[PDB]
């Protein structure tokens, strides 16, 4: 009851999992950090803890900073580093898009510098050069 209660494998997130490697036999009342595969970045409580041989449920994974590469680097916009696309990051990192030295925001555009999350960055358009 108090001594016997070792938990089992800890439940994963939406395409997530422990920041190490899934365990089959875990220590009771033990907790660990979670993370999502690839550039996927969850949100909530990646730190899960098993209770009486019954874990909890990790937070929620957020689609990485995967914006459109056929639209940004297409018309005339890229990253603040200007290196072809470079529109990929880990959900939670800042992603500043440029209007390609020359072209100026077409107004109807969204924003240059922003934050990627769930696969969204509000890519502008820009026009000039």
UniProtKB/Swiss-Prot annotation:
PTM per Swiss-Prot/TrEMBL: Sulfated on tyrosine residues. Another study observed glycosylation at this position.
Localization (cell): Secreted
Tissue: Expressed in the retinal pigment epithelium (at protein level). CFH is one of the most abundant complement components in blood where the liver is the major source of CFH protein in vivo. in addition, CFH is secreted by additional cell types including monocytes, fibroblasts, or endothelial cells.
Outcome when changing residue 108 to C: In CFHD and ARMD4; rare penetrant mutation that confers high risk of age-related macular degeneration
Resulting phenotype, residue 80 to A: About 50% loss of C3b binding
Result of altering residue 81 to L: In AHUS1; about 40% loss of C3b binding
Disulfide bonds: 7-50, 36-61, 65-116, 99-126
Sushi domain ranges (all copies): 5-63, 68-128
Summary of the function given for this chain in its UniProt record: Glycoprotein that plays an essential role in maintaining a well-balanced immune response by modulating complement activation. Acts as a soluble inhibitor of complement, where its binding to self markers such as glycan structures prevents complement activation and amplification on cell surfaces. Accelerates the decay of the complement alternative pathway (AP) C3 convertase C3bBb, thus preventing local formation of more C3b, the central player of the complement amplification loop. As a cofactor of the serine protease factor I, CFH also regulates proteolytic degradation of already-deposited C3b. (Microbial infection) In the mosquito midgut, binds to the surface of parasite P.falciparum gametocytes and protects the parasite from alternative complement pathway-mediated elimination.
Disease: Basal laminar drusen: Drusen are extracellular deposits that accumulate below the retinal pigment epithelium on Bruch membrane. Basal laminar drusen refers to an early adult-onset drusen phenotype that shows a pattern of uniform small, slightly raised yellow subretinal nodules randomly scattered in the macula. In later stages, these drusen often become more numerous, with clustered groups of drusen scattered throughout the retina. In time these small basal laminar drusen may expand and ultimately lead to a serous pigment epithelial detachment of the macula that may result in vision loss. Complement factor H deficiency: A disorder that can manifest as several different phenotypes, including asymptomatic, recurrent bacterial infections, and renal failure. Laboratory features usually include decreased serum levels of factor H, complement component C3, and a decrease in other terminal complement components, indicating activation of the alternative complement pathway. It is associated with a number of renal diseases with variable clinical presentation and progression, including membranoproliferative glomerulonephritis and atypical hemolytic uremic syndrome.
Domain remarks in the Swiss-Prot or TrEMBL record: Sushi 1-3 domain represents the minimal unit capable of cofactor activity. The property to discriminate self surfaces from non-self surfaces depends on the C-terminal region made of Sushis 19-20.
Assembly, per entry: Homodimer. Also forms homooligomers. Interacts with complement protein C3b; this interaction inhibits complement activation. Interacts with complement protein C3d. Interacts with CR3/ITGAM; this interaction mediates adhesion of neutrophils to pathogens leading to pathogen clearance. Interacts with complement factor I.
Protein name in the entry: Complement factor H
Organism listed in the record: Homo sapiens
Full protein stretch here: 1107 to 1231 of 1231
